[PDB]
Ligand binder design. Structure first.
Ligand code: FMN
Ligand code: FMN
Lengths: 204, 204
């Protein structure tokens, strides 16, 4: 590992009852430490044959019960999630040698949430998001580029495109992982059932 | 995107026929760019309920047809792979704004390969990999720490522990993603077919 910052993990010896509280604390410190792109989540979805796929998406919002991300409903992750809502993401912060694993069911939020989040983006991002049909075959790159440039001509916000949506990943289990000392990595694992949240430690 | 390096995607316009050639190119360039931990793979595996789980593992070797990583057979990932070999991993390189998605089936290599790999590791790594039962519940961190300290009393190399193994993820489809210009991300997607590999471009 290449981290130079021994990150406090005071939640290891004393675990909060709710994993959302550790997730907030950790993101707050990542911010202080200048962690480069701490919300880049490596997100796994699963196809109808039990075969996973992965890509980076950004955690756009923290909710009470989960993390939210924006994407296109008809992308590959969107098509997978429509038949199998179970997902898992991992964040890995090289600077502080920390990993966070988030497992749960990701479900599509109301249109209004999507409209709000869409319109929160810098309007410069809207052209390609409308022009591209995410994850479909690109037959002509120049055609796509021209469509987006014509859209960029408006020089302001564009309407949310059909299929632009938000999913919320409702947490069913979470692991917080810290480097520890002597390779004894520190693994704090939380789990949920209709009984609620419990935690335990895992061996590295 | 905090991408401090504008990275060309030389293969995008006229791609090689086999994706492993691109992977090797991309990994070699990543090292020369100074990408930090370019082999930290966010690896997804899938339980018997179709629910994915993720974590980081390091690509220990490039095989002829895939990527090799070391782990423990009775870890969560290893229990999951034993019942469903289909797996997916993403590399994300913040500095050059590149991602590589690797999809395939992961199969365990012979003991000889795992022994060689195990023996190539810095010997300080041996104690904990033997003393810990990866991803089992940790009963008592002091006791685990004592056992690894005890093992370390021997000058390594120490013997490979039962269950320490290498998996090779044999590629079935690969995506190379680059940031491109004007948000028109450059996605090159390879799929293993009849007579071997084909590729196409995907929309961002
Ligand atoms: C740093 C970074 C952030 C990204 N964030 C998102 C995002 O939040 N939402 C999104 O749909 N795609 C995002 N992408 C693009 C995805 O990685 C992927 O290319 C696209 O969603 C299509 O994924 P799919 O074909 O597996 O569904 C991001 C890519 C990078 C490298
Ligand atoms: C950057 C880094 C590299 C890692 N490399 C490996 C590795 O190569 N093999 C391994 O078994 N665990 C590796 N780990 C630990 C894994 O993330 C994980 O905690 C462990 O394998 C148990 O995963 P599981 O419970 O999901 O099976 C690495 C962790 C970090 C953060």
């Amino acid at each position: 590992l290449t981290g130079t910052i021994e990150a406090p993990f005071p939640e290891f010896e004393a675990p909060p009852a709710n994993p959302m509280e550790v997730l907030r604390n950790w993101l707050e410190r990542a911010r202080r430490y200048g962690v480069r792109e701490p919300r880049a989540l490596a997100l796994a979805t699963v196809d109808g044959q039990g075969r996973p796929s992965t890509r980076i998406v950004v955690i756009a919002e923290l909710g009470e019960r989960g993390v939210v991300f924006a994407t296109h409903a008809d992308s590959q992750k969107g098509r997978e999630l429509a038949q199998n809502p179970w997902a898992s993401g991992v964040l890995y912060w090289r600077e502080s040698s920390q990993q966070i694993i988030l497992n749960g069911r990701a479900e599509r939020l109301p249109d209004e949430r999507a409209d709000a989040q869409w319109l929160s983006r810098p309007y410069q991002t809207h052209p390609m998001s409308i022009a591209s049909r995410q994850s479909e075959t690109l037959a002509d790159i120049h055609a796509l580029r021209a469509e987006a440039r014509r859209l960029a001509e408006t020089d302001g916000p564009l309407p949310r495109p059909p299929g632009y949506c938000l999913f919320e990943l409702c947490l069913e289990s979470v692991e917080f992982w810290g480097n520890g000392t002597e390779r004894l990595h520190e693994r704090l694992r939380y789990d949920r059932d209709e009984g609620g949240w419990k935690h335990r430690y895992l061996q590295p």
